[PDB]
Amino acid sequence: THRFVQKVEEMVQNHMTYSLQDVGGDANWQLVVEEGEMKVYRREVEENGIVLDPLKATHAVKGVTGHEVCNYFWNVDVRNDWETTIENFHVVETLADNAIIIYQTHKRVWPASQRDVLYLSVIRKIPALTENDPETWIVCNFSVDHDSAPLNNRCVRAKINVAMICQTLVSEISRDNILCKITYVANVNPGGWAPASVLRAVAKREYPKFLKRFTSYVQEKTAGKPILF
Numbered sequence: 001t002h003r004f005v006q007k008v009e010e011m012v013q014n015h016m017t018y019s020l021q022d023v024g025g026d027a028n029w030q031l032v033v034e035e036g037e038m039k040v041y042r043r044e045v046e047e048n049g050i051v052l053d054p055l056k057a058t059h060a061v062k063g064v065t066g067h068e069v070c071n072y073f074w075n076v077d078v079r080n081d082w083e084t085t086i087e088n089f090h091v092v093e094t095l096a097d098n099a100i101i102i103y104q105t106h107k108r109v110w111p112a113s114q115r116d117v118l119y120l121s122v123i124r125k126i127p128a129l130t131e132n133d134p135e136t137w138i139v140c141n142f143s144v145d146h147d148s149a150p151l152n153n154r155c156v157r158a159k160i161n162v163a164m165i166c167q168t169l170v171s172e173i174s175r176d177n178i179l180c181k182i183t184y185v186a187n188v189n190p191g192g193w194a195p196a197s198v199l200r201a202v203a204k205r206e207y208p209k210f211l212k213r214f215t216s217y218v219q220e221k222t223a224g225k226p227i228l229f
């Protein structure tokens with residue numbers, strides 16, 4: 001029980017309600033890039049001339065569990081092993097053993113000014129409602145206000161609502177028989193102004209690169225370890 005428990009519950013529930021839905025049949029999502037099981041979609045949205053384009057991706061990763069994927073996504077201690085777009089990050093506050101508030105700066109993308117972010121990051125297990133449903137592991141990263149926020153005059157403050165939502169299929173269980181189904185959503189307000197073409201090019205390049213890189217990292221770090229369901 002920290003002061004964000006209720007907000008966390010709301011953000012997680014919204015993602016469970018809305019973000020998990022399959023968008024194969026939904027023409028409102030534009031499928032931008034497909035590489036195998038990796039499917040990356042966006043909606044073209046601008047507010048006050050700033051690109052907000054919602055990002056939604058699915059993926060199916062052999063050999064790892066949702067629990068493992070989420071631990072690796074969440075655990076700050078391995079962040080620098082997979083992240084390629086971060087210049088700096090600091091843990092601002094520990095709320096609980098499954099929740100922290102993080103400040104980070106993104107590498108500058110010329111010619112836009114650098115962005116920073118301040119967000120609560122929480123990892124949660126959502127039990128299968130019925131014996132028919134999969135359990136879900138989720139990480140949610142969403143912007144919050146904080147006082148120990150750094151002054152950084154080089155940066156415009158972006159605001160994010162990201163979730164990595166994982167269900168695991170199992171087919172001695174070996175990694176050969178496990179598949180992790182990922183839905184990843186990112187809604188990013190870059191703040192300020194940045195050229196629309198730049199924001200779209202960054203999204204189109206960096207999201208598939210992240211998903212490929214990050215998932216491969218989890219496969220590589222877990223191979224030959226006992227499975228953490």
Ligand SMILES: CCCCCc1ccc(-c2ccc(S(=O)(=O)CCO)cc2)cc1/C=C\c1ccccn1
Pocket residue numbers: 083085106109112113115117141158160162186188190194198199202203206207210
């Ligand atoms: C001019 C450039 C503006 C950059 C806008 C931007 C700010 C923040 C973020 C962001 C993206 C993912 C997360 S997370 O998944 O929670 C993991 C922790 O880092 C947190 C923040 C994205 C983006 C915009 C594009 C973009 C896309 C994939 C990689 C990098 N940048």
